Amino acid sequence: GSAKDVKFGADARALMLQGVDLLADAVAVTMGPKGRTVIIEQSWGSPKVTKDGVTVAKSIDLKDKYKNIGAKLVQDVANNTNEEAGDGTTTATVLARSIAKEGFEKISKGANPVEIRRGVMLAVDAVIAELKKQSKPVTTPEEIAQVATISANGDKEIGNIISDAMKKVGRKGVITVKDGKTLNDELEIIEGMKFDRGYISPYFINTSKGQKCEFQDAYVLLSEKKISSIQSIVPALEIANAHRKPLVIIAEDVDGEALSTLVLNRLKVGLQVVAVKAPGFGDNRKNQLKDMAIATGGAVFGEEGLTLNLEDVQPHDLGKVGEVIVTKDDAMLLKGKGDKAQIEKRIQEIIEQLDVTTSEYEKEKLNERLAKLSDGVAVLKVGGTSDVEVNEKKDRVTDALNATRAAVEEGIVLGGGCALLRCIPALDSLTPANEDQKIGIEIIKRTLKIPAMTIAKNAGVEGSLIVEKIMQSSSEVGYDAMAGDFVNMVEKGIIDPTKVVRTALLDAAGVASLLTTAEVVVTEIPK
Amino acid sequence: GSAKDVKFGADARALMLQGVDLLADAVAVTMGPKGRTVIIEQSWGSPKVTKDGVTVAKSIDLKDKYKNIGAKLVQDVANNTNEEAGDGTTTATVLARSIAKEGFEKISKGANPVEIRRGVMLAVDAVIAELKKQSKPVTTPEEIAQVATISANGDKEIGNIISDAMKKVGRKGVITVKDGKTLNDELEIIEGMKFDRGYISPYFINTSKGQKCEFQDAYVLLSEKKISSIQSIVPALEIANAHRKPLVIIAEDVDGEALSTLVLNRLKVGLQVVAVKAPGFGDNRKNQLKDMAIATGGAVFGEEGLTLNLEDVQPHDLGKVGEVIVTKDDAMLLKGKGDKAQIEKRIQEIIEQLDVTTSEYEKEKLNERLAKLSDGVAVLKVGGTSDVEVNEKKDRVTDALNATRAAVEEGIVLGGGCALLRCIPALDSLTPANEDQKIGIEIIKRTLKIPAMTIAKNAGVEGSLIVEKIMQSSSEVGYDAMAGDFVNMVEKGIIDPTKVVRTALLDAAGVASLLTTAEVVVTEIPK
Amino acid sequence: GSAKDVKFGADARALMLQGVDLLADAVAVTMGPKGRTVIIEQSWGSPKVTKDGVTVAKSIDLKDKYKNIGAKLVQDVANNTNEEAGDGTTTATVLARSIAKEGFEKISKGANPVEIRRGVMLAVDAVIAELKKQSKPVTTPEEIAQVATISANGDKEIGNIISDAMKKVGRKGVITVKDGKTLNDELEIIEGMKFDRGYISPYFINTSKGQKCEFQDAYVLLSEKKISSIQSIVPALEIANAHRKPLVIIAEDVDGEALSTLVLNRLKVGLQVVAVKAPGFGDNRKNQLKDMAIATGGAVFGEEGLTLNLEDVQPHDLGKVGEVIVTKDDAMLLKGKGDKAQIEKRIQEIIEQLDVTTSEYEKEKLNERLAKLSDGVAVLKVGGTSDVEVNEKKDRVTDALNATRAAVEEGIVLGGGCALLRCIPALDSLTPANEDQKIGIEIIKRTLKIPAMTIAKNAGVEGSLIVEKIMQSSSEVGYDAMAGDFVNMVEKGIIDPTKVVRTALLDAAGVASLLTTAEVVVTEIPK
């Protein structure tokens, strides 16, 4: 029922391309080892300084709504890449801008932009197949350090710290980053618990900068079954309001109504509560719940044998933890002191249950519980002289951690944008079905040179010349833009995770090729 | 030294196309037998009503300068066609708009608009060759009446009057149009003299609607040689100021200084004077000069034998005429009374000199003098109840006269836009040198259907369907848009002059293909 | 006494670079065989369409005065190149923009821009020496046709016509361009006179579009000595005002006061007069004076023997010509009908005087008078369907004539911007005296790739890639941007005049490096 402005065709496409260009320019100045930082004004306090593509992308909104549409779509590209890999958002942004520009250029009366999108998707699938074919698994801790160093703007100490943490707690251990008060970075191993379930509702979030649910010294509520009555959760609320700890509850499903009462209690000032779902579904659920009960210290309500009721909640029957971190994906409970004698007894029980029988699937769960109570959660404490440098370095360490985890998940390819460059001959072996698919394949093939061009351009040299010298060289040679020479990139350690490259390409292509198909733009009149 | 606005590329091209579209729409509503009229506001008096393409074109100027640039270029198309043929300006306008639109559409990064212009010119030359190949000479007075009827919006009486005038004074006789006070049109022949020389300077023009130098009952001044002295033209000026009658002078070359004094005398209020150059260069010049001297009545100054001086100018030694019409191309004198006995004696002298000897080139000049004294100038007087109706009908009669003269000059082709339609297969036999020439040939081939489409669209039917039914028919069949059926156009008399068709195509192509090659538009900032 | 705005340093330099960039962008779109045209609005009539760099340059003035300063300086570059060579203004503009950009970039606190300008001059002198060392003379008419074809946007017929004219009247004959009424171009030689002297004062110009003094059928006044009295020029003025013909006077020096009276007579409406100076200084002056005296038909006033006075001026004692074109540099006296028997007698006198004695300097003057009266002035008549097309084609023909004349004057180098590219290794052999001279040499060496880059960029390909492939190829190989491949440029006829290249480089460098030295800009406040 609001009055709208309707634009058609090429002027609308150019207006969207203007917003795409502004956002991608501001993001693209941060690309590579010679990229620079962006200062973003914050309303509440000090401005933030970042070299992160998705942060710069999400911080820019435009007054002109036709430009803001393209800006929001490239924000979607950057945010989708950050969600799926945690790295490669600047690459995704420049690839999205390139595909948008080349798609907008090749639009005519007889052109079919939908079949151009089809050819773009076909070419991108071929490139992703070639990326998987040229990928290499990570087999050494030196490769781990190299990936973490490359992903952290060539910070050797950050990569060394990440490599040491992954050596101490395993390549699939839980590592988290928080801000340290001293000047130097440090790594500590403390006993920690993590399961891949988050909050049901995103209404409990307390910090706005971190956008998480962070709690210190919280009571742990356990309900193995469904919560029995309102007269069973209200005494728990009164005990939590009595004994000065907030309530973190672990349960099957708190979705409809008890979650609703917790939301309207959170709406009241000061009262803190958060809910997470069960990790497992079978016997592993009960085993992990008993592990958490022994590691916290208290009792369990909801069992079938002892019939302990939530109605008779008591301070000694609940577990106490140090710090609770709740996110969208996983829940962290940290520094939870229990009965250490009972923790050792449960460890003995687990390692004695190891030597009973083999079934090749239950032993994986029992050993992951063993590593849960055995290998501590690594904590990376980032140091600096002020909050701005700490936040910038924290972004870099988070990038390095995400990239290293993606590297052990999927493998590594050539860095410096050279993997996309070496995937160019794979597109030359495709035969398009019609002319519009040929246009799409050509768009993707011209787009595949953009990240190396941007990395070289940020170093102050001519990017197209560098890219031509890269494709003229052998397949192992690429441009080191830090030293400004042509090197064996694998030997020099300039490598990238395969997951990051393929997800940046896929998200950029998927959004930008759909944006290309537009003919009419409908916006709200600014009132 | 004036501040300018500079625009680049597609937005500038679209802004020019907007002015082209406005002017061509207003012109195109007047096309064909079912076209309508345009009312143009006039500052000095009553608004004018016209069905003439170049009048509507020249009457439109736009406030936006980027639109006004395209409007001025299509005005150039219409005015060039009117100057070269006097007919076919609406056709030239629609062809220019079509070529501008199709050229602006096929402009990309890799496209070369200059070679597209080259291909356009090649295709247009091929079409003009095919038009000449399919043309037919005019051999009958019925074809003359048919051409004059078609060119005057199907006015049978106008075409009959033009055919009767050309029957009485010859197909190459001089016919002029004026407006009569009575309601009926009337044709009459009395006398007349026309030679193809006009005024040297365009500063003597008295009427603004006709844009000509029209004089009633003027003196004839004759200087066979160059004018001797200021003391020879000043007594002529004083005698002209004495005997209540303006001065039309016939001479070799009045260009630099005496013409300048005549201009600054014309700047004074009331004083009327005009100058025209000699018709011939050889003995024909002296023979024609003696012919007007005998036909006007007086004497001649500037001869070698009698040595009559311009200094001793006398009232009885100068000729007197009835009306002088001076244009850019030819000078007209009408109703010039001389000594009719001496006129008959000069006629006897010419017809007796006819039977002396033959040289096949001097006898042509002798016989054209014979037709000068023999075949009088036909005058067409257009009637109506008011000035607006006679002005509209005068435009139609002028169109019909120009088209009939072009028809006897060059021939006739199929009317209704069917000649350009039948020239389409000639373009299919060309092989372009590159892709840009192919684009130009395709632009011209798509443009060749525009006049028949516009004629059919003005009749309220679907133009593209009509054009397809024309090209599916035999080469003699076209659409009569007046009766709304498909007929043998030659038998029904719907025919066109070949000159009109070929000049409309050539001017439209030549300007619009050059306009297509633009990338930057520089305009003045409106101050 | 007018209020001024004063700007310092970097923002002033950026503001000037903005105007430089705007003008150079608009000029640079027209470069090379795939360059496009610029449409310029004209106040009086139809807009003009041009591919000429200096026309686009001079047509752009900006409202912001800091931008308009840089725009006026690059206009100065383009106009100086046009004055010194008549071709290469787009190249001069892009080189000036490049030098201004690279000079503004390397300005710091410790940098000395004056010594950077010194290094720029040293580098440009080295490049010009290398251009002279790599040039070759023109020895064939096919090279003449090739240069004229390249300079006229690849128009084979224009180059063929220029080659035929230079074959018929000699490579140093006088050729001029005028617009023809027919559609096709034509060339004809009849007669003609030219000496390298123009008007003393630029006040008689009546052709506003051509910026020349164009006169038709003018009187020839001759004063071999100084003009005697006011009572000798006043009867000449009265005779000119008597015999309908304007006055072109040939004399020693009409500078102070008789020129002043001619100016105040020209201020009055209609009165036309123009003065030109003597061709020679010695006996050649008298010989040439008698030559146009015989070739015009009349007498001579001012001699020592016959004592003919200017006071007794007579109509039969003055010469009459066909057309007079007066320019800043030379005078065009065309179609002068003298006594052809006396012209033949003077030709016989000259050729019989030629067989008397040898002195190796006077015989050159005798033979140049012989070629003046024997080899006629060629005239090129440019055709088209409208005024805009003939104006664009006239610009191209004038470019081709100027380039061909410069080619026979100085020689030819490689086309396509490859000569400046091949002059790059000459700069690598220089040693700078300090760091600022090194900065200037580097600026010029980076600038030397700009014309080939712009030519390749206008064709829709990547310019830097093309320039690298040119520099890696053999010294004879360059990029044909019309066919889009790499060829022997000399064999394909893509060649340039050495004079055009060296004057474009010198004129760009001299102004742009001085503009680089600026620190403070003082402008007028807009009132």
Ligand SMILES: Nc1ncnc2c1ncn2[C@@H]1O[C@H](COP(=O)(O)OP(=O)(O)OP(=O)(O)O)[C@@H](O)[C@H]1O
């Ligand atoms: N020394 C180097 N030489 C060449 N390329 C390098 C070098 N160091 C890093 N790179 C490349 O830089 C890219 C990473 O750039 P950057 O970290 O600015 O952006 P990103 O990974 O796309 O996104 P995000 O903004 O999330 O960090 C990778 O392609 C990597 O291979």
Ligand SMILES: Nc1ncnc2c1ncn2[C@@H]1O[C@H](COP(=O)(O)OP(=O)(O)OP(=O)(O)O)[C@@H](O)[C@H]1O
């Ligand atoms: N009865 C008819 N049926 C079909 N076509 C017709 C008929 N009468 C005229 N025509 C066509 O109409 C066209 C002439 O239209 P019109 O007189 O409006 O414009 P024009 O000749 O292009 O320009 P101008 O404005 O100078 O008259 C010609 O192509 C002619 O063949």
Ligand SMILES: Nc1ncnc2c1ncn2[C@@H]1O[C@H](COP(=O)(O)OP(=O)(O)OP(=O)(O)O)[C@@H](O)[C@H]1O
């Ligand atoms: N087919 C071609 N291939 C490559 N280069 C070409 C070709 N034709 C012309 N050129 C180059 O184009 C340049 C001339 O371009 P252009 O005529 O637009 O500019 P200009 O001579 O600098 O200036 P202007 O003509 O505007 O006074 C020359 O360097 C010439 O060698």
Ligand SMILES: [K+]
């Ligand atoms: K980045």
Ligand SMILES: [K+]
């Ligand atoms: K019409």
Ligand SMILES: [K+]
């Ligand atoms: K040019």
Ligand SMILES: [Mg+2]
């Ligand atoms: Mg990164």
Ligand SMILES: [Mg+2]
């Ligand atoms: Mg008509």
Ligand SMILES: [Mg+2]
């Ligand atoms: Mg040129």
